[PDB]
Design a binder for this molecule. Structure first.
Ligand SMILES: *CC(=O)N1C[C@@H](c2ccccc2)C[C@@H]1C(=O)Nc1cccc2ccccc12
Ligand SMILES: [Ca+2]
Ligand SMILES: [Ca+2]
Ligand SMILES: [Ca+2]
Ligand SMILES: [Ca+2]
Lengths: 107, 97
């Protein structure tokens, strides 16, 4: 980084959130095989680099195939965009329930 | 008096946080504080998702949207039904990709 970097505020961050959801999928889904689906190696790379806060530092290797079968609803061994949206929606519902129930919880 | 900023090493995680916090920025204004009524839903759409609104901004347009999103027919949009809405938008955006 030897030149200035310029940044602009976002008027509608929820719209940019949607753009990031779409682009992150294709960042990995186009690495091998079908360019519009995620295979196990691409999904594992996505979660590890893009969603580490949700992985609980678990790297056993057996764990991923359980999630992959969960996400693979049409059972074609890959995750398409619609199944990826079900996944993200599910993560977001979990975060929302943590927020909504927080004042009632204790460690 | 200090202001603080951070870079976002994992922007997909922040996008998820924006999805959650945007919901609650509008759902607590009226009535049930964890669901969007028609008024709250209209405000969220116009302010947070203006690129997906369209010229159709009549009250019949928002009432049809409310009806398409309110799956359990309680005249509110809860967080799950809001997620279905957002996934539909994502899937549209992806088609044009
Ligand atoms: C939305 C949801 O239920 N889940 C998201 C998933 C996740 C794991 C790591 C990083 C980001 C998201 C965990 C969870 C899930 O889908 N669990 C699923 C259902 C039951 C059992 C089970 C067992 C082992 C692996 C996954 C699994
Ligand atoms: Ca692929
Ligand atoms: Ca699949
Ligand atoms: Ca409300
Ligand atoms: Ca409802």
């Amino acid at each position: 980084g030897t030149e200035n970097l310029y940044f602009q505020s976002m008027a509608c961050p929820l719209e940019k959130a949607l753009d990031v959801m779409v682009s992150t999928f294709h960042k990995y889904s186009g690495k091998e095989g079908d360019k519009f689906k995620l295979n196990k190696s691409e999904l594992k790379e996505l979660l590890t680099r893009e969603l580490p806060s949700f992985l609980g530092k678990r790297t056993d290797e057996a764990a991923f195939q359980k999630l992959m079968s969960n996400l693979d609803s049409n059972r074609d061994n890959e995750v398409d965009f619609q199944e990826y949206c079900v996944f993200l929606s599910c993560i977001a519902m979990m975060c929302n329930e943590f927020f909504e129930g927080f004042p009632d919880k204790q460690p």
